[PDB]
Design a protein around this ligand. Structure first.
Ligand code: NDP
Ligand code: NDP
Ligand code: FOM
Ligand code: FOM
Ligand code: MG
Ligand code: MG
Lengths: 408, 408
């Protein structure tokens, strides 16, 4: 039985993954499950699946160990990055589902790559932060990356077999891949003024017309930073530069992305917007399996809309492409500044529209710019340099926010 | 150089094929080209490409041989089925593009199958008439069939590698194919009353909003018999029964068909409606090549509409599925009665809406029904039995038309 370790098991992507597993018992073994703050949920999950290991936050280590023994479970409890890395590199784990949010997922994804694991990547921030190093390390050590991100899974499904195996084949012109097309819902402020976007409450920003997701990706969807990060993710996943990857607004969230070929064929994946489809595809690959989604009814669709991105209004997407052109240092600055600004938005400290301001200022910061030319792709010193650069951006983005609330 | 024989070179599909060839001269050799009534066009094509053989109609044999020698060309002239069969089975021919319209294309397609050729099938009537025999014969003799028909080429592009090679693999549930979805423009009378459909002139029926095609497929598009024939073609091509193949109206002619998988993924081919895309894909397979189409601009699409087929209004599609369920005898009756009724419509003898009447009456005819149980799939006597049954249907459909213009 394919052995599974699920990182970020307590969150949104955690839920859909687990929902597939419950439809397919005796196909997968659950070896490990991780959470951070939701101890009780993690416990509940441990009692249900009886995993060999689980990992929680350092502040919940003791408490969770006590509850686990009180429940009479044989399960090992771990904590912090330490435990994630152990689980990600664990010898008895066949497949790792990387669904931790944000930079926090970086070390363990990198560890699964280092251990030659089959990796199901939801955690898009870890490739924005360290794409060169992640991919290099995977190839070096024989790890496989299947994308879980909906768009990237669509693109992956719509690419030839040879290129799924080896992303570099995309540059052989026989295959005739011309460009990739990323679809974006345009989030909940697509048909709203800039005025209403400033005034947005958190409830308005966090809720999405078509998708039910984690908090952060919800805010990113509203600002369109999500597509920005997806732009960089696609770059590393399919070994392209930003010029080969374009973006179309599509509010229905039915078409999930396209690959354009030289003969004029656009191969696309369509589906009801539900992460169980991409997750199910990646779990069973090369096979397929029922996912438990309510399949798309083509008779009841109506009009699928398409539209050019309004880049004044969704400057995050502008900035993301700008950063993609500058390389990894600027992609770290993009991502981390974004994490800090989103935290500030959710904490009712800035306006939704200030997220773009903060992120520009950090991209255009001289102190940050100085780091834009290091070897973040170095297999021995690269990690240390990404984590250091991350700390610096957190410091400056925070300062930037303080400054903005008065004047610069 | 891949050697090419083009059957139906003077027609619509002929034009697009040839237009690709002119963009790729150092890639294919033109070995043979065929036409029927357009002698001068065929001659013009012979002077341009200098083919080894050409074939025309029996009544133009002499005339065309005279003009060919007067032009100083070394090209052999052939005529009738005789010549088509010679060309289709010619030892120096690598690939055959079957783009003759109607049952007329049957013997030569069957001959290319019998000779183990790579075959690019536009000619959908020959598989409606003799699908069992064609496919059996191809597999027996090692012929390859790539679909040129737009919908089938879309479906083919959206299917896994293993199944492209071997259509039978589709029944292995690992691949998780659930059903196929055929898109239909709904022709030029989609948003018009039944009254206006009766009164339709030939000019109204023959012209199509999105496609420029031969006369017959144009009338079939207007009545939706085209999708009916496409339904049966898909059945034999991808080895399914009609229940696994469904139909959606899509007036924009951008999405050209879909394959639905068990996880909820719909893989689809999108493109501007232009047969150079499917033709180019089939010619270069497994590679790809520029086709000379103006590629789809996603920014300028607007609304892609989808809708259930109105089956009272497009009874041909009802009748086609009915025939598909009854098997080959009834598919011959469907197709041939359709040929005869379309000729009658174009000759200003029946109303557009009478095409469905005629075709039902022939499907429900006792004299025809008696033949619905023969072995039209027999490798030694099957052909004779299809051609005989064809002659009978032509006779009865004609009578049916005479009767209808007075009363039954
Ligand atoms: N539909 C979706 O939700 C989609 C999500 N993604 C991506 O998948 C990833 C997960 O997103 P999503 O599930 O929405 O987010 P959630 O906020 O719902 O889930 C986050 C998960 O990671 C854990 N986590 C949070 N902070 C830390 C930390 N500092 N250290 C270790 N673990 C932590 C959480 O634990 P706890 O909650 O127990 O504190 C939870 O298990 C993201 O990278 C997102 O961009 C991609 C496409 C679609
Ligand atoms: N876009 C399109 O046009 C599409 C076409 N198809 C299919 O492709 C095939 C060709 O259609 P299309 O190109 O539109 O039709 P056309 O009417 O343009 O062309 C028909 C071709 O076959 C020849 N032909 C006609 N009658 C006979 C006969 N009795 N014996 C031998 N040859 C004959 C014609 O020669 P001549 O003209 O010199 O008489 C011509 O070369 C059809 O099977 C159609 O269903 C499928 C999808 C799209
Ligand atoms: O993979 C799924 N998502 O990233 C959710 C997409 C929301 P968006 O279209 O507004 O980026
Ligand atoms: O392959 C191309 N065609 O069959 C032309 C399609 C016209 P329709 O959608 O009305 O059948
Ligand atoms: Mg996504
Ligand atoms: Mg067609």
């Amino acid at each position: 039985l394919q052995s599974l370790a699920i990182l970020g098991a307590t969150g949104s992507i955690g839920d859909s993954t687990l929902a597939i597993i419950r439809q397919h018992p005796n196909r997968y073994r659950i070896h490990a499950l991780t959470g951070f703050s939701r101890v009780d949920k993690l416990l509940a999950l441990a009692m249900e699946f009886h995993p060999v290991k689980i990992c929680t936050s350092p502040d919940n280590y003791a408490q969770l160990s006590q509850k686990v023994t009180d429940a009479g479970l044989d399960t090992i409890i771990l904590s912090g990055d330490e435990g994630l890395i152990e689980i990600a590199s664990d010898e008895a784990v066949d497949t790792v589902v990387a669904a931790i949010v944000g930079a926090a997922g970086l070390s363990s994804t990198l560890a699964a790559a280092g251990a030659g694991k089959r990796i199901l990547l939801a955690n898009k921030e870890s490739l924005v932060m360290a794409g060169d190093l992640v991919i290099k390390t995977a190839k070096k050590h024989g790890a496989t990356i299947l994308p879980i991100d909906s768009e990237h899974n669509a693109i992956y499904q719509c690419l030839p077999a040879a290129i799924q195996a080896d992303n570099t084949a995309i540059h052989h012109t026989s295959y005739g891949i011309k460009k990739l097309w990323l679809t974006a819902s345009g989030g909940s402020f697509l048909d709203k003024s800039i005025k209403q976007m400033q005034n947005a409450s958190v409830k308005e920003a966090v809720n999405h017309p078509n998708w039910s997701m984690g908090q952060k990706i919800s805010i990113d969807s509203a600002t369109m930073m999500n597509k920005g990060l997806e732009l960089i993710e696609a770059c590393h996943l399919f070994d392209l530069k930003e010029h080969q990857i374009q973006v179309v607004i599509h509010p229905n969230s039915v078409v999930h992305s396209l690959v354009e070929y030289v003969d004029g064929s656009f191969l696309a994946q369509l589906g009801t917007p539900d992460m169980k489809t991409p997750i199910a595809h990646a779990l069973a690959y090369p096979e397929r399996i029922k996912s438990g989604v309510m399949p798309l009814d083509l008779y009841q669709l109506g009009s699928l809309k398409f539209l050019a991105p309004d880049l004044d209004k969704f400057a995050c997407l502008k900035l993301a492409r700008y950063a993609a052109r500058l390389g990894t240092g600027a992609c770290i600055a993009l991502n981390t500044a974004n994490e800090i600004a989103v935290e500030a938005f959710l904490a009712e400290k800035i306006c939704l529209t200030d997220i773009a301001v903060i992120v520009k200022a950090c991209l255009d910061d001289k102190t940050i710019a100085q780091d834009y030319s290091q070897d973040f792709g170095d297999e021995v010193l690269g990690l240390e340099r990404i984590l250091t650069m991350d700390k610096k951006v957190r410091k400056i983005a925070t300062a930037k926010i303080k400054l903005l609330k008065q004047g610069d």
